[PDB]
Amino acid sequence: MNTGMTPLMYATKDNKTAIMDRMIELGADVGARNNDNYNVLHIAAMYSREDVVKLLLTKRGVDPFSTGGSRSQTAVHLVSSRQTGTATNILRALLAAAGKDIRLKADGRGKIPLLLAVESGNQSMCRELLAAQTAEQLKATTANGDTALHL
Numbered sequence: 628m629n630t631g632m633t634p635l636m637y638a639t640k641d642n643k644t645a646i647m648d649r650m651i652e653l654g655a656d657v658g659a660r661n662n663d664n665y666n667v668l669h670i671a672a673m674y675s676r677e678d679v680v681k682l683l684l685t686k687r688g689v690d691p692f693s694t695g696g697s698r699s700q701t702a703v704h705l706v707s708s709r710q711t712g713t714a715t716n717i718l719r720a721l722l723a724a725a726g727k728d729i730r731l732k733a734d735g736r737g738k739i740p741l742l743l744a745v746e747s748g749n750q751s752m753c754r755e756l757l758a759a760q761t762a763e764q765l766k767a768t769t770a771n772g773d774t775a776l777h778l
Contacts, residue, residue, distance in 0.1 A: 628660065634667045642676040647683045654688050662692040669700040677709050677717040685717055695724035702734035710740040710752045718744075718752045722759060729763035730756050737769045745775040 630636050638657035641650040657664075657672075665671040670678065673693055677685040689695065689705075697705040706726060709717035718740060722730050733739035740756035741764065743749070753760075757775065760767070767774040 636661060636664065638664065638672060639666055639670070639675055642672060642681060642684050642688070643679045645680065647681070647687070650681075650684050651687055654684060655691065658688065658691045658693075662688075671697055671699070673697050673705045674699055674703070674708055677705060677714060677721075678712055682714075682716050686720070695721060696726035701736070701738070703738065704732075704734065706730055706740050706756070707734055707738055707743055710744040710749060710756055711738075711747070713747065713749050713752060715752065718756055722756055730760040731764035733764075737767075739764065739767070741767050741775060742769060742778070746778050 628636065636657070637653050638650075638661060641653045644650075662672065666675060672688050673685060674697060676688055695705065699708060703711060704727065706718055706721035709721050722740065730740045733742065739760055741753055741760035744753035744756050745767075750757075753775075761775075769778070
């Protein structure tokens with residue numbers, strides 16, 4: 628492992644530069660070395676790779692050694708931060724996986740996929756995300772009481 632002044636490595640640098648071949652080989656060596664590594668702002672490989680542009684690095688990176696389920700500094704899960712970035716394949720494939728398994732195990736601020744998808748105008752993601760999250764948490768009890776119809 629080698630890095631400079633910033634704590635970012637070649638996995639986060641190749642994961643955000645559309646280098647999916649070299650991010651697949653470096654994602655395999657980094658997948659054996661630092662697959663569960665996060666950034667300085669807790670941007671993990673599923674979080675930063677599923678955050679910037681990458682769906683193939685989230686599928687190949689989440690396929691080899693990164694199981695479905697993560698948590699950021701603000702408890703943003705992979706389905707939650709996938710819904711926070713308005714991603715369709717990341718929140719759809721993340722909601723298809725049984726990490727929270729209902730998409731209703733919310734964050735620390737109640738930021739489930741229905742809350743973050745409902746507050747941001749992400750109803751294309753809140754169709755399936757609030758289909759499971761309304762299959763468990765249709766009465767989405769938030770902290771301020773702002774549910775889907777209330778927020």
